Structure 1
Amino acid sequence: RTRVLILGVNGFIGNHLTERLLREDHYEVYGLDIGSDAISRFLNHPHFHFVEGDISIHSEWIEYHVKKCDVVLPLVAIATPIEYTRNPLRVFELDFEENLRIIRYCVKYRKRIIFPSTSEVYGMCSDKYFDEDHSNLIVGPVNKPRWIYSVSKQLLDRVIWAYGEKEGLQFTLFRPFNWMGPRLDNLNAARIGSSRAITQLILNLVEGSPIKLIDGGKQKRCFTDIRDGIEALYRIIENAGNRCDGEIINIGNPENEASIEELGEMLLASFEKHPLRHHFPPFAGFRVVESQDVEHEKPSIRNAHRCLDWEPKIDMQETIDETLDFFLRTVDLT
């Protein structure tokens, strides 16, 4: 069986991916993290092995697990907008420098790396559909520090591409577009995965604070149910016919497009009709705020079509209802 090393397994993607791989009987999962509360259900599974670790502290212990395994999925990164500007240097050191160390262990021991790039690399790209192979990448002047995350991730993609081109690194990059479903990552957990925007909104409803609409909340986004997203990630790991080698693949549902405002209204509506609504405060309402932005973020999914024979199935309403439902029933009221 194939050994899958998941760095930063204690969260949204690690939970769903692990459940997926373990349902099949030809995988061995090694989940590395500093905690295990998010995947405790798997600690006793015969084919899951928790590994104590931190990519900023451990060097050797991680290198060892890269040599021991077959496929590597590094999910540790700080991807919360306020941080790009609040603690830029840490975002850079963790997201760029520490992950570069892991990319290098992979080329050194000739292992396969499945790397989470980001939908933010496209920046202010004018294409209606962001294309992994044709769209230009657009960011603002260096005096707009918000772009440091975007560019750091883009540079890593290029370094990976160079290793694959000059040193035989076998890799696949994937770019998730607002994945959502049960077991969302904490708003400030340094793990790549769940949509921060929908997480923030649900928190607004749960805590009784207002839903802020930056300049009207007109910017559009696409949302993907984790059942669809993880199926695609799963197929990248399978890599049938080796079709994913050297590929960059957007993973999103371009049909589930909505403005921040409409998404807010959809969650509210689903929220108002929920059986546990009374355990939460009254809706505080929509606050129009006004403070560099991205006005649209829709993916082209031709590569996912080609390399994975994948098409997203769950409609917007289903994703919304299920994500909110699991969240509300999981909250500790006391």
Structure 2
Amino acid sequence: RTRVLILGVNGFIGNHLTERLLREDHYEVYGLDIGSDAISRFLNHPHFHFVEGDISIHSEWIEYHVKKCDVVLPLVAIATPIEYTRNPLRVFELDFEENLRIIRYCVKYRKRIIFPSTSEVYGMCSDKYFDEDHSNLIVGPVNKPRWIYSVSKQLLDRVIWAYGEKEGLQFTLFRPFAWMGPRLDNLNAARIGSSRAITQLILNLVEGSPIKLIDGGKQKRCFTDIRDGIEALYRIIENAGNRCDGEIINIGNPENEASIEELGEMLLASFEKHPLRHHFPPFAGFRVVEVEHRKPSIRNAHRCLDWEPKIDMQETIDETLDFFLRTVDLT
């Protein structure tokens, strides 16, 4: 059966993908991370194997598991916007340099790599819907250091493309658009997964801090239920008819567009109607402080995966906030 190597498994994507792969009885999951508290349920599973590892510290030990497995998913990256400008060099060394090693491990041993690109790769693209194959990528001048993350992830996509064009590297690049659901990542976790903006809103509700609406909270974002997201990711792993080879696939729900303002009001509404609301501080209000599109084209997901998002916003909003409130440490 197929050996799947998940680097950075102790988190949002690693938990949901491991559960999906383990449901089918033809996958061997090798989850690599420095901890396992977020995937404690799978350690006893006969087809899950935890690997102690850190892609910054380990080289030989990561190379061995790339050769040992069949498909690799490198999910380790600092994907939190405040860190792009605060620690730009650490963001660059981890997200780019360390992952380039794993990429090159995959071409060396002729393994298939399913690499998480970012939706920030489109930047300030003028298209209403972001096309993986046609949309232009627009960023600001280099004196605006916010873009160091978007430009770094883009160069990694191009280097993967070059290895596929020139060294026969089998790859699929997927770009998640605001994934949310049970088991969100930590706000400062160096694991690619849950939409950092929406978990910050829920943290505002849980902690009793106001919801900061940067310049109005009008910039809109298209969020996706992890049930819909992990389903498309699982089908990329399946690679039916090899239709995903060399492809770039957005994985988002373009019918779930909402501004940061509308997100807060939506989460707040579900917040008040929740049975556990009394355990949390009163709502602190919306504060105005000092990229606006981010709608994905999902034709590539239609073509390569026969995938269409099915869950409705209200279901996704209620379930993400519900799971959060019951698993919050009150003591």
Please indicate the TM-score interval, normalised by the length of the shorter structure.
over 0.9
Determine the C-alpha separation between the residues in 2 that align with 1:69 and 1:51: 12
Determine the C-alpha separation between the residues in 2 that align with 1:54 and 1:288: 39
**Once the 2 structures are TM-superposed, how far is the Cα of residue 296 of structure 1 from its aligned partner?**
1.1
**Once the 2 structures are TM-superposed, how far is the Cα of residue 206 of structure 1 from its aligned partner?**
0.2
Which residue of the partner structure matches residue 79 of structure 1? 79
2:278 maps to 1:281? no
RMSD (Å) for aligned C-alpha atoms: 0.3
Determine the C-alpha separation between the residues in 2 that align with 1:100 and 1:5: 16
Determine the C-alpha separation between the residues in 2 that align with 1:21 and 1:61: 23
Determine the C-alpha separation between the residues in 1 that align with 2:119 and 2:248: 11
2:309 to 284, 306, 312: 312
Which residue of the partner structure matches residue 299 of structure 1? 296
**Once the 2 structures are TM-superposed, how far is the Cα of residue 125 of structure 1 from its aligned partner?**
0.1
Which residue of the partner structure matches residue 123 of structure 2? 123
* Consecutive aligned runs of 4 or more in structure 1 exceeding 3 Å deviation: none
1:254-301 deviation per Cα after TM superposition (whole angstroms, max 9, x unaligned) = 0000000000000000001000000000000000001xxx01100000
1:151-186 deviation per Cα after TM superposition (whole angstroms, max 9, x unaligned) = 000000000000000000000000000000000000
Residue identity (%): 99
Which residue of the partner structure matches residue 166 of structure 1? 166
Determine the C-alpha separation between the residues in 1 that align with 2:25 and 2:170: 24
**Once the 2 structures are TM-superposed, how far is the Cα of residue 234 of structure 1 from its aligned partner?**
0.1
Determine the C-alpha separation between the residues in 1 that align with 2:329 and 2:190: 22
**Once the 2 structures are TM-superposed, how far is the Cα of residue 308 of structure 1 from its aligned partner?**
0.2
What is the DSSP-based 3-state SS (H/G/I as helix, E as strand, rest coil) of the residue aligned with 2:319?
A: helix
Determine the C-alpha separation between the residues in 1 that align with 2:7 and 2:65: 10
What is the DSSP-based 3-state SS (H/G/I as helix, E as strand, rest coil) of the residue aligned with 1:55?
A: coil
**Once the 2 structures are TM-superposed, how far is the Cα of residue 304 of structure 1 from its aligned partner?**
0.2
**Once the 2 structures are TM-superposed, how far is the Cα of residue 248 of structure 1 from its aligned partner?**
0.2
Determine the C-alpha separation between the residues in 1 that align with 2:66 and 2:269: 46
1:202-252 deviation per Cα after TM superposition (whole angstroms, max 9, x unaligned) = 000000000000000000000000000000000000000000000000000
1:68-98 deviation per Cα after TM superposition (whole angstroms, max 9, x unaligned) = 0000000000000000000000000000000
TM-score, normalised via structure 1 length: 0.99
**Once the 2 structures are TM-superposed, how far is the Cα of residue 322 of structure 1 from its aligned partner?**
0.2
1:11-41 deviation per Cα after TM superposition (whole angstroms, max 9, x unaligned) = 0000000000000000000000000000000
Which residue of the partner structure matches residue 246 of structure 2? 246
TM-score, normalised via structure 2 length: 1.00
Determine the C-alpha separation between the residues in 2 that align with 1:283 and 1:40: 33
What is the DSSP-based 3-state SS (H/G/I as helix, E as strand, rest coil) of the residue aligned with 2:56?
A: coil
What is the DSSP-based 3-state SS (H/G/I as helix, E as strand, rest coil) of the residue aligned with 1:212?
A: strand
Determine the C-alpha separation between the residues in 2 that align with 1:27 and 1:121: 31
1:18-67 deviation per Cα after TM superposition (whole angstroms, max 9, x unaligned) = 00000000000000000000000000100000000000000000000000
Structure 1: unaligned runs, 5 residues or longer: none
Determine the C-alpha separation between the residues in 1 that align with 2:180 and 2:173: 20
**Once the 2 structures are TM-superposed, how far is the Cα of residue 104 of structure 1 from its aligned partner?**
0.1
Structure 2: unaligned runs, 5 residues or longer: none
Determine the C-alpha separation between the residues in 1 that align with 2:108 and 2:329: 45
Number of equivalent positions: 331
Determine the C-alpha separation between the residues in 1 that align with 2:289 and 2:279: 28
